[PDB]
Amino acid sequence: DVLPPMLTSDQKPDVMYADIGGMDIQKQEVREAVELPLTHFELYKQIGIDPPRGVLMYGPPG
Amino acid sequence: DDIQQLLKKINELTGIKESDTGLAPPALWDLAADKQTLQSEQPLQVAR
Amino acid sequence: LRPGRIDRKIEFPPPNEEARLDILKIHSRKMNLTRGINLRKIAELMPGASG
Amino acid sequence: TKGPDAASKLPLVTPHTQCRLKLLKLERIKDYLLMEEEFIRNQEQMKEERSKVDDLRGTPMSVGTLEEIIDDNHAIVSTSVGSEHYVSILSFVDKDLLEPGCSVLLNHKVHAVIGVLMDDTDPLVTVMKVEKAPQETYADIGGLDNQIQEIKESVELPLTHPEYYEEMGIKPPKGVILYGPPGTGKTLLAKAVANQTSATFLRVVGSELIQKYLGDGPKLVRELFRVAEEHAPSIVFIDEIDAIGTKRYDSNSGGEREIQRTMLELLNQLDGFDSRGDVKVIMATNRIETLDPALIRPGRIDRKIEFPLPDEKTKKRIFQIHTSRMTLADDVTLDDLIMAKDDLSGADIKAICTEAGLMALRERRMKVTNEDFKKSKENVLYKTPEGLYL
Amino acid sequence: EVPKEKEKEKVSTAVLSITAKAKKKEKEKEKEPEPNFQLLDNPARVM
Amino acid sequence: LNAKVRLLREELQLLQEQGSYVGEVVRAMDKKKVLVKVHPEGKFVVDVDKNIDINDVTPNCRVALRNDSYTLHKILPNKVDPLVSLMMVEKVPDSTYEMIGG
Numbered sequence: 289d290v291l292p293p294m295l296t297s298d299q300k301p302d303v304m305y306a307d308i309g310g311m312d313i314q315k316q317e318v319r320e321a322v323e324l325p326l327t328h329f330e331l332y333k334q335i336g337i338d339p340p341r342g343v344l345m346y347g348p349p350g
Numbered sequence: 351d352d353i354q355q356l357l358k359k360i361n362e363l364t365g366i367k368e369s370d371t372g373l374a375p376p377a378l379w380d381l382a383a384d385k386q387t388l389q390s391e392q393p394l395q396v397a398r
Numbered sequence: 399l400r401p402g403r404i405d406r407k408i409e410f411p412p413p414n415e416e417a418r419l420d421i422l423k424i425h426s427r428k429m430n431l432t433r434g435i436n437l438r439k440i441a442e443l444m445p446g447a448s449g
Numbered sequence: 450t451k452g453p454d455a456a457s458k459l460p461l462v463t464p465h466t467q468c469r470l471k472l473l474k475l476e477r478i479k480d481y482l483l484m485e486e487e488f489i490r491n492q493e494q495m496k497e498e499r500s501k502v503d504d505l506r507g508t509p510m511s512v513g514t515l516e517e518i519i520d521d522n523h524a525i526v527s528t529s530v531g532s533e534h535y536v537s538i539l540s541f542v543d544k545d546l547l548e549p550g551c552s553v554l555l556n557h558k559v560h561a562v563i564g565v566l567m568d569d570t571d572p573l574v575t576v577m578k579v580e581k582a583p584q585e586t587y588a589d590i591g592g593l594d595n596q597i598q599e600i601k602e603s604v605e606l607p608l609t610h611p612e613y614y615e616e617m618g619i620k621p622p623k624g625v626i627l628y629g630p631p632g633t634g635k636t637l638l639a640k641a642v643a644n645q646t647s648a649t650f651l652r653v654v655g656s657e658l659i660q661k662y663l664g665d666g667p668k669l670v671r672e673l674f675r676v677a678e679e680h681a682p683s684i685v686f687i688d689e690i691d692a693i694g695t696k697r698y699d700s701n702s703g704g705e706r707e708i709q710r711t712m713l714e715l716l717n718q719l720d721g722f723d724s725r726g727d728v729k730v731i732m733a734t735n736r737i738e739t740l741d742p743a744l745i746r747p748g749r750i751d752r753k754i755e756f757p758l759p760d761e762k763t764k765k766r767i768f769q770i771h772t773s774r775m776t777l778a779d780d781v782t783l784d785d786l787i788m789a790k791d792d793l794s795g796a797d798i799k800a801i802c803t804e805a806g807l808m809a810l811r812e813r814r815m816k817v818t819n820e821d822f823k824k825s826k827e828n829v830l831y832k833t834p835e836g837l838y839l
Numbered sequence: 840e841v842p843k844e845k846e847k848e849k850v851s852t853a854v855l856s857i858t859a860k861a862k863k864k865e866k867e868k869e870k871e872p873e874p875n876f877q878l879l880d881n882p883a884r885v886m
Numbered sequence: 887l888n889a890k891v892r893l894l895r896e897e898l899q900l901l902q903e904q905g906s907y908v909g910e911v912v913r914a915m916d917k918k919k920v921l922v923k924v925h926p927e928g929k930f931v932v933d934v935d936k937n938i939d940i941n942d943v944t945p946n947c948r949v950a951l952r953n954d955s956y957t958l959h960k961i962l963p964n965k966v967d968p969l970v971s972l973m974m975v976e977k978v979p980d981s982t983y984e985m986i987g988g
C-alpha cells in the first residue's frame with residue numbers, strides 16, 4: 289500500500305478584500321504577483337513572462 | 351592501464367584473511383559436546 | 399581559495415554594454431515586441447545593471 | 450602488539466621522461482605481476498572432523514562483550530540489547546584470549562562462548578587506516594631540505610638506525626607539527642613519509658574526532674591510538690588539528706565542552722599517566738597561534754616545523770619539479786617568476802604550471818612559452834599603504 | 840568407453856611480452872565407404 | 887490465458903516468502919563469512935550463500951540477510967545519510983548555454 293500522507297494553512301483566514309479599505313494599488317500589485325499566476329497563467333504565457341514569485345511590502349509600523 | 355587492472359584483479363583473487371575467530375589448537379577440544387547445546391542458555395546476570 | 403583546492407577563480411562582472419543587449423534579447427525572445435523597440439537603447443538606459 | 454602493517458607498493462621505474470627504457474621497465478613490472486597472478490591461479494586451481502565441528506558451531510554467530518569470566522567452562526557474556534547472560538564455554542576456544550571488554554562471539558540459539566573475535570576495530574578507524582602507497586616520494590618536495598631532514602630524524606631514523614640513540618641513552622622525538630601558510634608542503638612531507646616508511650600510516654582529520662553521540666569522541670580517539678599502538682610501530686597523521694585544537698575556554702555550550710573533552714583525551718593519549726609505545730604523531734595546521742599549549746607542549750609535540758613561503762632557491766627548484774614533465778620551449782627562462790618577490794606558494798607554482806599548459810592548449814599548442822607563463826601567473830594569482838614607510 | 844580422467848592442466852604461459860619473441864627466435868634458429876548390407880544371423884535383431 | 891494464470895500463481899507463491907533484514911557489512915572476514923551489523927540490534931557473522939562472490943562484499947556495504955538463517959543473499963544499493971542521498975540531481979535543470987550572454 290501507499291498511504292496518502294499539515295502544519296500551516298489550515299486555519300482558514302477570515303479577513304476579506306471588502307474588509308481591507310483603500311490600498312487599491314497595493315492590492316493590485318500583490319494580486320498580480322500572488323493570485324493571477326495561479327488563476328490565469330495564460331495571460332502570462334501570452335506576454336511570455338516569468339511570473340514574479342516574490343514581493344516585498346514597505347511601510348510604517350502599521 | 352592493464353597493470354592497474356591486474357592490480358585490481360590480483361586484489362580480487364586474494365586480500366581476504368581467515369582471521370582469528372578464537373579457534374583452538376587440537377588435543378584440548380571436546381567431541382560429543384552436545385551435553386552443551388543440550389543444557390545451556392541461562393539468561394541470568396539480569397537477575398537482581 | 400588556495401590554488402590547490404580552488405584552482406580557478408572566475409569573476410562575473412555586471413554585464414557591460416551590449417552584454418546587457420545580449421541579456422535583453424535572451425529574456426525578450428519569448429515576448430511580443432513592436433517594430434520599433436530598440437533593445438540597444440534599453441541597454442544604454444540601463445547602466446551598471448546586473449543580469 | 451600484532452606488528453607493523455605498512456602498505457604494499459610496487460617498485461618505481463626510475464625514468465619519468467617518456468622513454469623506451471620506461472616502457473621496458475614497466476613491462477618488467479607487468480611480466481612479474483602476470484607471473485604472480487599465474488602462480489596464484491595455477492596452484493589454487495590446478496593444485497572433516499573440524500568441518501563437522503564448525504558445522505555444529507552456530508552458523509549466524511552473534512557478538513557479545515564478555516564480562517566477569519567465571520569457572521572454567523561457564524563465562525558471562527552480554528548482548529547488544531543491554532542484557533547479559535551466564536553462558537557456557539565450548540572446547541573450541543583457545544582460552545586465555547578472553548578478557549573483560551573483549552568482543553566475544555556467541556551462538557545464536559545456545560548463547561555460549563564460541564569465539565573471541567580478537568580483531569574488532571571500529572569502522573571509523575579501519576577506514577582511516579592507510580593501505581595504499583601514494584606516489585609522492587621525497588623527490589617532488591622541492592627544497593624544504595631542512596624540514597625533510599628534521600622529519601626524517603623524527604620518523605625514519607629510529608626505525609632504520611636504532612643504534613645512534615641507544616648509543617647515548619637519548620630517546621627519539623615522539624611528535625612533530627607541520628605548521629604554516631596555505632600551501633607549503635605540509636601534506637607532501639606526510640605523503641612522502643607514508644611512501645618511504647615501512648611502518649603503518651594512519652590518516653586522521655580533526656573534523657573526524659568530533660562525534661555526534663556525547664562521549665563518543667573521547668572513545669574514537671582512544672580507539673585510534675589503541676589501534677596505532679597495537680597494530681604497529683606506526684605513524685599517526687592528524688591533518689588540520691586546528692579543527693579541534695583551539696585553546697580551551699570556559700565555554701557555555703555543550704558542543705564546545707565535548708570538543709574540549711576530545712582534546713583532553715587526545716592529550717591523555719599523547720602523554721598520559723601510563724606510557725606511549727612506538728607511535729609517532731605528525732600534526733598539521735595553518736595557524737599555530739590558535740592552539741592549546743597542552744598539545745603544543747614539548748612532551749607530546751617534540752618538534753615544530755615551520756613551512757615558510759619558500760624562498761627564491763626553493764621556488765626555483767619547485768618550478769623545476771612541476772615543469773620537468775612538460776614540453777618546454779627553449780625561449781622560456783624560469784627566472785621571471787623567481788626574481789619577483791610576490792608571495793608564491795608551492796601550490797601556487799603548481800597552479801601556474803597547470804594554467805600555463807592550459808593557455809598553450811587554447812593557443813592550439815602542446816609546449817609552454819614565456820608569454821603563456823606570464824598569462825598563467827597573471828590569471829592565477831588571487832590577491833602597507835604607499836609612502837607610509839620610506 | 841571409460842572416461843579417461845584427464846590430467847589437471849594449468850593455464851597458458853601468458854604473454855610476458857617476449858615469450859613470442861623467444862619462440863620466434865628458437866624457431867628461426869631451428870630453421871572407406873560403409874557397406875549396403877548386413878547379413879544378419881538367424882536370430883536377427885530386426886528393428 | 888495459461889501464461890497470465892501461471893504468472894499470477896508464481897507471483898503469489900514467491901510473495902508469500904518471508905522478507906530479509908538489511909544491514910551493513912563491517913568487514914568481509916574470510917570467504918563466505920561476513921561480519922555484518924543489522925540495525926538496530928548488534929552485529930552477527932553470516933553464512934554467505936553461493937550466488938554472489940565474496941569480493942563484491944566490500945566493507946561498508948548494505949547486505950540483505952535471510953530473515954531465517956541470517957544468510958546473506960544480495961548486495962543492496964550501498965547508500966547512507968538520506969540527508970545527502972536526497973541531494974544528487976535527478977532532474978536536469980532547463981537552463982541552456984543559449985540562455986546566458988556576455
Ligand SMILES: Nc1ncnc2c1ncn2[C@@H]1O[C@H](COP(=O)(O)OP(=O)(O)OP(=O)(O)O)[C@@H](O)[C@H]1O
Pocket residue numbers: 402589590591592593630631632633634635636637638688689733734767770795796799
Ligand atoms: N615543496 C613542494 N614541492 C612540490 N609541490 C609542493 C611543495 N610544497 C607544496 N606543494 C604542493 O602542495 C600541494 C598539496 O598541498 P600542501 O601539502 O602544500 O598543503 P598544506 O596547506 O601544507 O596542507 P593541508 O593539505 O593540510 O591543507 C601539492 O599540490 C603540491 O603541489
Ligand SMILES: [Mg+2]
Pocket residue numbers: 633634635636637
Ligand atoms: Mg598539504
